Amino acid sequence: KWAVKIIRKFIKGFISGGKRWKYM
């Protein structure tokens, strides 16, 4: 039941069209 957790839902749909991650 966190705060920022569910805020990660917001950008997950709106901002996250592609993914941005470095393997290393």
Curated annotation (Swiss-Prot):
Q: Which residues cross the membrane?
A: none
- Can you tell me which residues the record assigns to a coiled coil? none
Belongs to which family?
Belongs to the TRAFAC class myosin-kinesin ATPase superfamily. Myosin family.
The linked condition is: Central hypoventilation syndrome, congenital, 2, and autonomic dysfunction: An autosomal recessive form of congenital central hypoventilation syndrome, a rare disorder characterized by abnormal control of respiration in the absence of neuromuscular, lung or cardiac disease, or an identifiable brainstem lesion. CCHS2 is characterized by shallow breathing and apneic spells apparent in the neonatal period. Some patients have other features of autonomic dysfunction, including bladder dysfunction, sinus bradycardia, and temperature dysregulation.
Function, in words: Myosins are actin-based motor molecules with ATPase activity. Unconventional myosins serve in intracellular movements. Their highly divergent tails are presumed to bind to membranous compartments, which would be moved relative to actin filaments.
Name of the protein described by the UniProt record: Unconventional myosin-Ih
* Annotated source species: Homo sapiens
Q: Which gene encodes it?
A: MYO1H
